[PDB]
Structures are given as C-alpha cells and as structure tokens.
Design a binder for these strands. Structure first.
Lengths: 103, 117, 109, 54, 142
RNA sequence: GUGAGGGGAGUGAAAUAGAUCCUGAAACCGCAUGCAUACAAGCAGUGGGAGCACCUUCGUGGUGUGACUGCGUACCUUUUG
RNA sequence: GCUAAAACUAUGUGCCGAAGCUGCGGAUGUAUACUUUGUAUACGUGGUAGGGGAGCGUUCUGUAAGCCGAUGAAGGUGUGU
RNA sequence: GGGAAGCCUACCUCAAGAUAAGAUUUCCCUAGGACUUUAUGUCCUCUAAAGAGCCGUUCGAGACUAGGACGUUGAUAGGUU
C-alpha cells in the first residue's frame, strides 16, 4: 500500500516505514505529523483517486530531526570585465518516518 | 616589520590544487592552468543547477506520453482531462506510477477520458 | 623479505638504463645474468654489477639459497647532473647537461 | 620549423611505445655445456667440438 | 533520486516484422525510428537503448510521391579532388534497397555511439523472406 | 678493479642525523596496486548515470574509477566590438 | 524526409515552452511601528569606469617575570568538521 | 520509341579494420586433483599439438622493415672444375 502526499510545495509517494527528507518544518523533534490531504491511496487493486483529495484518508509520520544538506559553491565571473563574486549555501531539511497509512 | 609571503601563499595555492583533483594533465598539476579550470567548473555548475529541472521535466513528460499512448490517449489530451477532472497530481508522481504500476495509470487514464467525455 | 643493492652516481642517462631494467624485470637471476652477460649495451655492465651485489648480500647477510631467487623489483631514478658549456658558431654558447642515475635492485624468493 | 605547443607526456610515452629491447638467441653447447650465443664460438675457443687454441 | 533509470541488464528487446509494400518512405521511417529508440515504453531513458528489433521485408516496394522517383538525388564524396558521385531513387532502389532505408533511418536517429548501437537493430531484406525465424518475430502493422 | 657505490656489524636519544650530512615544499622523473581505454571526432569540464574493486556500523553507507548521455569556442589587456 | 502535407489561406480546441510569474525553505538593504530592542509589515537586492559601508588573514610592540610546550612548538603532509 | 567523345557498365590495379570484420578445401588439440566467490570460477600436478618466430646461408626483394628461397633427407652463398 502506498499514498501520495504534499509537503513543502512538492509531492511524494510513500509506503509504511519509509524515511524521507522534506523542507524544514516547525515541528519539534519526536512529534507526530498528520497529513489529512492525501491525493491518492492504492491497495493493490483497491484504487482511490481524490478529486482534489481523498475523503477520509490519513497518513501519520514521526519527526526524526532537522539538518542541513551538503555545501554548494556559487561562482559568478564576467570575463574581461574585472568582476567576480562567490558565496556558499547549505539548505535546511526535516527528516520524517512514515508510521501509518489509512485509506 | 618585514613580512614574508611563503606560508599563506603556499596554503592558497594548495587549496586550489586540492579542488582541482581528478583533472587531466596540467589542469591538476600547474597552478595557472588549475585556477582557470576551477572557476569554469563553478560557472558550469551554476548554469546546470537550472538546466537539471528542465531535463527531468522533459523525461517525466516522455514517460507519461508513453503510458497515455498505451492506454489510448495522447499526453495533451490526458493532461487536459485530468485538469477538467480536478486531479492535481504532478508529472513526477505520474511518471513514477507510469513506470512502476500499469493498473493505477490505467485507472488515471480512465478518469481523464471520462472527464473528457 | 627482499634484499636490496643500490648503485648511486652511475655515469649514464636514466632513460638509457631503463631499457635494460625493463628487459630483466621479473625474471630468475640465472636467466637475467645470462641476458646481461650477452648484451652489448653499456648499461648492462652497471646493472650486472648491481644485481651481483644484491645476490652476494642475499647469500652472505641473510643465508638464502640462490637457486630460488628472482628479480622482484628494479627501477632507475635520476641523479645529480653536471653542467658544461659548448661554444657554437658566431659567439653563441649552449649549456650541456651530463646526466647520472641511481639503480636499485631487490631480489627475493 | 619548431613546435607551436609543448608536447604532452602522454604523447611522448606513446611515441616511445616502440623502444623496447629484445633478447638474443642463447644455447647450451654440447662438448663443454655452458651457454653461448647460437652459431658463435664460445668465449673459451670451442665450436662444434673443435678447439681453436690448444 | 526517486526517478529511476532503466538498467541495461533488465531491458528486453522484442522482435517485429514489417512489410513495406505500398508504404510511404518517410512516414514509415518515423515509426521505425520511434520503435528503435524505444520512445513507446514507459521505461524510456535517454542514455539507455530500450528499443525493439525491426525486420523490414519487401524493401523495393517502398514508394515516394510526386516526381521524387526521378528527382530525389543521393550524393557521396570520395575524398579525392572532383570525386562527387550522384544517383537517384529509381536506380538506387533497383540496385541496393537496404541503403535507402539505412539513410532514411540514420537521418532520424541520434548521431553518436548510442545511435550507432540503435541502428544495428534494423534488418532490411529485399525479398519476402528473412533468415530470423529462430527469433520468432511478431507481425507489426505500422 | 686494492675503484666508485652499497649490504651487514658497531657508535649515537636519533644514521631516511653518514660527510654539499637540521627541517626537506613545488615544478619535473620512476616503480606497485585498483578501475577505465584499440568503430570513435573538438577549451577536456559540468548535470545525470550502469557496471566493477576495496572498506563496512551491511545501507536510502564510505573510498577509487566513469561505459552511455543533455549543455558547453581558455585567461588577461585593449576596444564600438 | 514531406504532396486530400510535415506547404499556403481562414477558424477553433488542447498542449510544450525562460533564470518571467506562482508555491515552499533561507539571506540581506531601506523605511514605517513595537515607543531599548531584533520582532512584524511594505518595497527592493544584473552591473564596467567610479563613489560609499563592513570585514579576514600576515610580521612586529604593550598587556606578558602571564598562558601552552620533550607526556613534543613552529614548519611539512593527510583526514574530519 | 530513337537519340552524344558526356553518366552507369565494360578494360587495368587495389580492395572484408566492408567492426556488416564474408566464402571454400585441408590440418591440430578429448588428462587427473583440491577449493568456494557454483561460475566460459580460482589454485596444484601432468601435458606443449597443427604451426609461428628467434638464429644461420642469402635474393633479379629492400632505408630499417616487410616479402621470396634454402638450413645436411642440402646446390642457399662462397670456392673448385
């Protein structure tokens, strides 16, 4: 069984027990999160496609922690024009672990 | 107060040469050549962070087109039908389903074609 | 365990000595000695000196038998060069480099 | 006429890929039993069971 | 990294046979190129060959419209000075039918090592027989 | 070769402190191991990406390599460019 | 490669398509209020010649008859952060 | 239907690296163990075939190569008649 959820302006297809990284959330570590806006639930042959959203479906996950991705260098250079600048970047993320899917 | 440049200059050149690991010939050995190679790599990476999204969207669209034509529609008609049926699933998930589960994609195609009818 | 001999400051180019080194690398000592004995290269004499010194070291300082030895490792490095001046036509002068090399031989069983 | 660009170490070694040496033809003599160059007199003056210096 | 690429070790190539009697050359070559490259499968990946094997029979019955039988030209150049050679469609189809299909599909495939690999899966035969009965090809009406 | 040079033994806290001998960087030149490479055209990278080798907390891990593929004509100066 | 077009003229229904616009996360300048603030909202953040602001490292003097150091300083070479 | 010193053949030479690597005639090799990574798998012992090359005497073949002839079951080169 798998479901389609939306978090942080993107969508993910998840199964129970899966760990995934999404955009940074405000939930404290150890808390539980409920998605009540499931777009799709599939149970082998039982298929539910929500018009915008499946009525009654719920996906429960638990927050593992917060972190930062690996460093990325940004380089800008205009040749023969005496211009150059650079900066670094690391993006924040939150880790989740799916614990329950109910259609 | 006379100042010698050796230690700091050596450290800077060594950091550049370390970022140049793996390149061919003088591009990983000679400071003048290696310095130019690192800046160009940075520029290429900056541009390709934008190119990547376009490439992957094209791939998703191609896989969705293959699935739709297996189910009797074209990509444009399937997208129109889903939009009229209010389904808001995006192309990345649609391509994943097309590649890994044919029955669910057939159900989505049936929904879109019913909306078109 | 390997037994080593080094000949340092041999009066020949490393590029020239490396041909003989590659010729004898990996063979048994008797076969290599035959090759060096019947070669006509100048570097053959120096390489033979180094190899015989290595065999003597293995016999006398480690108590090994020569019937099972082989040339396990051999390589040539660059030595210190001598600098000279050669006069050309019309008053111009060129710089001459006289090269030397180091030879390392290791034998083992 | 001279080069416009210095040649890479890779191409230099590729040119030298034909410079390897080769082995002579050596053979054990009958009458005395040491190694000698084939078709040559041994270093002690023997060839095909004849002596050159008595 | 949720979007996956097809693995070459798991790709499965099926065999098909196509009769070219009465077909238009270009409108057949487009479909052949599609199926050689693998655009019709949901596992399509730009850097992997996922296509099918296509056998083409009755190659000399292919057709062109208008006056192209007399007028369409085929050129090649030997690299000697003045060495440009020229022929037309009627002579070429009576002489070497396979070359016409090879040129038409080569033009529509990608130009690289993967394209060279993909063109090797097209077999073109003049008559009505092919020697690949051991591969059990299926009839494809395209 | 009564040579040069080395291998043992010995001195020394240390001899890769052994005589142009404290430390011993880079250009440049070897040897060994792992992977890739002899049907394919270009500033040599970059975004993807299969396979292989070793390590492993056995992974949605680490290290090395990069078949195939989208894009891509060095740097400085001087110039309307 | 294309001929009741994959050409031209007219009309329509969809779709692709940019670093434009929207979504989510983060940084920063100015202004208006919280009547200390570092919290909100609003408007901005392509740049040569130039102008303005804020910083990192290096050698030496005081603080220093202090603090670290043969249970290993500076320097060299890797790894992680 | 006819129709030119022009085009394709026809004449001479090269040509399967034509990676699509083509065809025909004839010849050669048929042994035992151990192990795990059960695989055209890895290490032992035993076997070196048909042939090719090194070497030699040489050429009306030749820069070096390559190519041709011969090596005592012999006229390949020199000498001798």
């Amino acid at each position: 069984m798998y479901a389609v959820i939306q978090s942080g302006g993107k969508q993910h297809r998840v199964v129970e027990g899966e760990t995934l990284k999404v955009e940074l959330l405000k939930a404290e570590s150890g808390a539980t999160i409920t998605f009540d806006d499931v777009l799709m639930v599939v149970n082998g042959d039982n298929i539910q496609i929500g018009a915008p959203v499946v009525a009654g479906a719920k996906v429960t996950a638990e927050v593992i922690g917060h972190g930062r991705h690996d460093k990325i260098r940004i380089i800008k250079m205009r040749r023969r024009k005496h211009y150059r600048k650079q900066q670094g970047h690391r993006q924040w993320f939150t880790e989740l672990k799916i614990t329950g899917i109910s259609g | 107060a006379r100042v010698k440049r050796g230690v700091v200059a050596h450290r800077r050149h060594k950091k550049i040469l370390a970022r140049a690991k793996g390149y061919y010939g003088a591009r990983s050995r000679v400071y003048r050549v290696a310095f130019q190679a690192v800046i160009k790599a940075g520029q290429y990476a900056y541009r390709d962070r934008r190119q990547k999204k376009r490439q992957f969207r094209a791939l998703w669209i191609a896989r969705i087109n293959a699935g739709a034509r297996q189910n009797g529609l074209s990509y444009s008609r399937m997208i129109d039908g889903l939009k009229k049926a209010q389904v808001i699933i995006d192309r990345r998930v649609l391509a994943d389903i097309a590649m890994h589960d044919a029955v669910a994609f057939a159900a989505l195609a049936e929904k879109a074609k019913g909306a078109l009818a | 365990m390997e037994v080593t001999a080094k000949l340092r400051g041999a009066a020949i180019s490393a590029q020239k000595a490396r041909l003989v080194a590659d010729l004898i690398r990996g063979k048994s000592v008797a076969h290599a000695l035959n090759i060096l004995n019947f070669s006509n290269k100048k570097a053959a004499v120096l390489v033979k000196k180094a190899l015989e010194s290595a065999i003597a070291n293995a016999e006398h300082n480690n108590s090994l038998d020569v019937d099972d030895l082989k040339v396990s490792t051999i390589y040539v490095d660059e030595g210190m060069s001598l600098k000279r001046i050669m006069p050309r036509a019309k008053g111009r002068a060129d710089r001459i480099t006289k090269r030397t090399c180091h030879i390392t031989v290791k034998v083992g069983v | 006429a001279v080069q416009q660009n210095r040649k890479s170490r890779s191409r230099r070694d590729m040119r030298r890929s034909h410079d390897a040496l080769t082995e002579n033809a050596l053979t054990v003599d009958q009458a005395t039993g040491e190694t000698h160059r084939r078709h040559h007199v041994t270093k002690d003056g023997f060839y095909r069971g004849r002596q050159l210096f008595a | 990294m949720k979007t996956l690429s097809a693995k070459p070790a798991e790709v499965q190539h099926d065999w098909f046979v196509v009769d070219a009697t009465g077909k238009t050359l270009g409108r057949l070559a487009t479909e052949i190129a599609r199926r050689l490259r693998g655009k019709h499968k949901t596992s399509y990946t730009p850097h992997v060959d996922t296509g099918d094997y296509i056998i083409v029979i009755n190659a000399e019955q292919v057709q062109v419209t208008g006056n192209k039988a007399l007028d369409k030209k085929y050129y090649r150049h030997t690299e000697f000075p003045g060495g440009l050679k020229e022929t037309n469609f009627e002579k070429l189809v009576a002489h070497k039918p396979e070359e016409i299909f090879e040129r038409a599909v080569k033009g529509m495939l990608p130009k690289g090592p993967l394209g060279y690999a993909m063109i090797k899966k097209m077999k073109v035969y003049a008559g009505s027989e092919h020697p690949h009965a051991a591969q059990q090809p299926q009839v494809l009406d395209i």
